Enzyme design. Sequence first.
Site, PDB file in Angstrom:
ATOM      1  N   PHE A 248      99.801   1.837  53.564  1.00 37.89           N
ATOM      2  CA  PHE A 248      99.902   2.977  54.485  1.00 37.89           C
ATOM      3  C   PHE A 248     100.746   2.698  55.744  1.00 37.89           C
ATOM      4  CE2 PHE A 248      95.210   3.697  52.974  1.00 37.89           C
ATOM      5  CZ  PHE A 248      95.649   3.998  51.692  1.00 37.89           C
TER       6      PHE A 248
ATOM      7  N   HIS B 266     109.146   1.995  48.287  1.00 37.23           N
ATOM      8  CA  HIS B 266     108.007   1.791  49.194  1.00 37.23           C
ATOM      9  C   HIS B 266     108.085   2.766  50.356  1.00 37.23           C
ATOM     10  CE1 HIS B 266     105.086  -0.235  51.725  1.00 37.23           C
ATOM     11  NE2 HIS B 266     106.011  -0.463  52.644  1.00 37.23           N
TER      12      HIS B 266
ATOM     13  N   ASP C 102     106.517  -5.842  48.765  1.00 40.23           N
ATOM     14  CA  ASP C 102     107.450  -5.045  49.588  1.00 40.23           C
ATOM     15  C   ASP C 102     108.392  -5.946  50.364  1.00 40.23           C
ATOM     16  OD1 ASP C 102     106.220  -2.635  48.755  1.00 40.23           O
ATOM     17  OD2 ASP C 102     104.632  -2.898  50.246  1.00 40.23           O
TER      18      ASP C 102
ATOM     19  N   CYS D  27     104.040   0.593  44.691  1.00 39.91           N
ATOM     20  CA  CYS D  27     103.266  -0.475  44.060  1.00 39.91           C
ATOM     21  C   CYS D  27     102.529  -1.345  45.073  1.00 39.91           C
ATOM     22  CB  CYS D  27     104.159  -1.356  43.191  1.00 39.91           C
ATOM     23  SG  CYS D  27     103.333  -1.757  41.648  1.00 39.91           S
ATOM     24  N   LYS D  28     101.288  -1.689  44.768  1.00 35.04           N
ATOM     25  CA  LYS D  28     100.507  -2.535  45.675  1.00 35.04           C
ATOM     26  C   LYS D  28     100.113  -3.888  45.110  1.00 35.04           C
ATOM     27  CE  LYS D  28      99.403   1.316  48.481  1.00 35.04           C
ATOM     28  NZ  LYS D  28      99.956   2.205  47.425  1.00 35.04           N
TER      29      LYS D  28
ATOM     30  N   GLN E 183     102.828   4.254  57.787  1.00 34.95           N
ATOM     31  CA  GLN E 183     102.901   5.115  58.964  1.00 34.95           C
ATOM     32  C   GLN E 183     101.625   5.033  59.800  1.00 34.95           C
ATOM     33  OE1 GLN E 183     102.349   6.201  56.066  1.00 34.95           O
ATOM     34  NE2 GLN E 183     100.661   7.668  56.177  1.00 34.95           N
TER      35      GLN E 183
ATOM     36  N   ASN F 187     100.843   7.067  42.452  1.00 33.72           N
ATOM     37  CA  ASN F 187     100.922   8.091  43.489  1.00 33.72           C
ATOM     38  C   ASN F 187     101.225   9.483  42.939  1.00 33.72           C
ATOM     39  OD1 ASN F 187     102.703   9.731  45.554  1.00 33.72           O
ATOM     40  ND2 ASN F 187     101.308   8.385  46.720  1.00 33.72           N
TER      41      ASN F 187
HETATM   42  O1  LIG Z   1      91.555   6.767  52.014  1.00 35.45           O
HETATM   43  C1  LIG Z   1      92.665   7.221  52.329  1.00 35.45           C
HETATM   44  C2  LIG Z   1      93.670   7.268  51.368  1.00 35.45           C
HETATM   45  C3  LIG Z   1      94.904   7.776  51.742  1.00 35.45           C
HETATM   46  N1  LIG Z   1      95.096   8.212  53.004  1.00 35.45           N
HETATM   47  C4  LIG Z   1      96.388   8.750  53.418  1.00 35.45           C
HETATM   48  O2  LIG Z   1      97.189   9.242  52.330  1.00 35.45           O
HETATM   49  C5  LIG Z   1      98.427   8.525  52.255  1.00 35.45           C
HETATM   50  C6  LIG Z   1      98.806   8.313  50.804  1.00 35.45           C
HETATM   51  O3  LIG Z   1      97.759   7.582  50.189  1.00 35.45           O
HETATM   52  P1  LIG Z   1      97.865   7.143  48.655  1.00 35.45           P
HETATM   53  O4  LIG Z   1      96.499   6.670  48.208  1.00 35.45           O
HETATM   54  O5  LIG Z   1      98.563   8.272  47.906  1.00 35.45           O
HETATM   55  O6  LIG Z   1      98.720   5.777  48.873  1.00 35.45           O
HETATM   56  P2  LIG Z   1     100.306   5.556  48.586  1.00 35.45           P
HETATM   57  O7  LIG Z   1     100.507   5.959  47.130  1.00 35.45           O
HETATM   58  O8  LIG Z   1     101.096   6.441  49.539  1.00 35.45           O
HETATM   59  O9  LIG Z   1     100.384   4.089  48.919  1.00 35.45           O
HETATM   60  C7  LIG Z   1      98.190   7.226  53.014  1.00 35.45           C
HETATM   61  O10 LIG Z   1      99.392   6.697  53.594  1.00 35.45           O
HETATM   62  C8  LIG Z   1      97.181   7.636  54.065  1.00 35.45           C
HETATM   63  O11 LIG Z   1      97.842   8.248  55.181  1.00 35.45           O
HETATM   64  C9  LIG Z   1      94.044   8.148  53.944  1.00 35.45           C
HETATM   65  O12 LIG Z   1      94.209   8.547  55.103  1.00 35.45           O
HETATM   66  N2  LIG Z   1      92.862   7.654  53.586  1.00 35.45           N
END
Ligand SMILES: O=c1ccn([C@@H]2O[C@H](COP(=O)(O)OP(=O)(O)O)[C@@H](O)[C@H]2O)c(=O)[nH]1
Lengths: 232, 232
Positions: free
Chosen positions: B93, B82, B117, B64-65, B95, B10
């Site tokens: 995601f 997380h 998580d 982490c996923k 929210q 991220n």
């Molecule tokens: O294809 C995408 C990728 C990301 N997001 C938004 O950007 C946030 C952060 O995405 P990231 O890929 O950075 O994932 P994270 O590291 O937060 O799991 C997500 O919670 C989504 O709200 C989105 O709307 N579409």
Amino acid sequence: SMVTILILTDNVHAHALAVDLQARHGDMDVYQSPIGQLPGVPRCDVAERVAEIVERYDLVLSFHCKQRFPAALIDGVRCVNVHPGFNPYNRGWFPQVFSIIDGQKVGVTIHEIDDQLDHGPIIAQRECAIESWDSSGSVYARLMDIERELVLEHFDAIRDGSYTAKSPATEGNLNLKKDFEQLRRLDLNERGTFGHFLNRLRALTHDDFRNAWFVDASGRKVFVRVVLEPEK
Amino acid sequence: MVTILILTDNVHAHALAVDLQARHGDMDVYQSPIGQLPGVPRCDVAERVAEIVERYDLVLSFHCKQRFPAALIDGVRCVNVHPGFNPYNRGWFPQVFSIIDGQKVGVTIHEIDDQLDHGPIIAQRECAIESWDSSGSVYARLMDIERELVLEHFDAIRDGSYTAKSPATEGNLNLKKDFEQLRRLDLNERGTFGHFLNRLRALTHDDFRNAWFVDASGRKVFVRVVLEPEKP
Ligand SMILES: O=c1ccn([C@@H]2O[C@H](COP(=O)(O)OP(=O)(O)O)[C@@H](O)[C@H]2O)c(=O)[nH]1
Ligand SMILES: O=c1ccn([C@@H]2O[C@H](COP(=O)(O)OP(=O)(O)O)[C@@H](O)[C@H]2O)c(=O)[nH]1
Ligand SMILES: [Cl-]
């Protein structure tokens, strides 16, 4: 130029178009209504000046008029209006808002004025397509281009009276300012299809205008508008 | 004294890790083999378990996923940050899913076990979802909360001096497929206006073209919503 034209509009785009028409034609005056809000533009209170207007003018050309002309004026001089809807569908206020919702055609209509609003013998009209991604804003912009081309293309014929206007087949429907206002409140509990809700939102999205709103659970008013982008 | 390995793909967490590196210093920052941060080196965790265990005292991951190998979990203390409120909407995601289902969202710092998580919570902080929030706007706040929560608890995380508590229940888990499913709007779906509006704001995150439908002419159209509360 034996034809002396009075132009009436409170619309900012139509006014700009009227100015070009003035450069082209010459024997032509441009006013707004007593309630118009165009800066620096003189006002004809049509209801009071019927006599002057008839004596002084050969043709009254209005754009986007919302009040009805007095019968005496309609009689004494040739009156033509340019309406940014496709008569007889969604006559009156903000045609493309209602067309996005009900699916009726929108466009620009040039027509002879009678005693009813956006009614009577059509001189010319072009339809404007409503794409699935259009908002009110994007359609309106196109309508203003259509209006400019349609009016410019047909100016000579309107001036000379060399057309035969045809009355629409049916009465259509009429929308008033109250009707737009009623659309603005979003009822979060209303049921419908996503397409229905989506149309509602796009019909109420017009650039920056804060049209659509709801009141949240805590009594806060929230403004909604939508962004639709077709793929490349 | 305590040598930390930080793992994140991220961009915001990485920036946060860079600051923590300035403070603590005995700390390496890497991304995964599939991460996309420019110029950041990659630990292929699955194959470097012995090296990681040997070299580090704490592995601290952000967002982490993928699941950690049992060998790594038993060999070195592993903590994850997380951006959800465990155990609700664990996984992808949070929210986005929280806006739709109304469960709490927030940031959770927790010990890593064999599930995603899941496992004893070290610290967590809730983030309020306003009726005018979109996924984008919540997420920005989540990134601030994450920064504050991590800086507040850093010494303890580093120390290992925290208490941790297992959540009472399992919650629910959302995966990439689930987000992908949300994206497709069914224009014939029936629901309340509020429901549909939650769906769109959930899928609105700045410029991301998430929400889409295919119109009658076979054209793909992306949709986002703009919500604006009146001045308090
Ligand atoms: O294809 C995408 C990728 C990301 N997001 C938004 O950007 C946030 C952060 O995405 P990231 O890929 O950075 O994932 P994270 O590291 O937060 O799991 C997500 O919670 C989504 O709200 C989105 O709307 N579409
Ligand atoms: O409060 C308003 C007033 C106007 N409009 C939009 O702006 C367009 C222009 O309307 P205007 O009042 O400029 O004049 P008209 O088009 O009726 O001559 C209308 O069709 C509406 O779609 C709007 O969204 N909100
Ligand atoms: Cl005709």
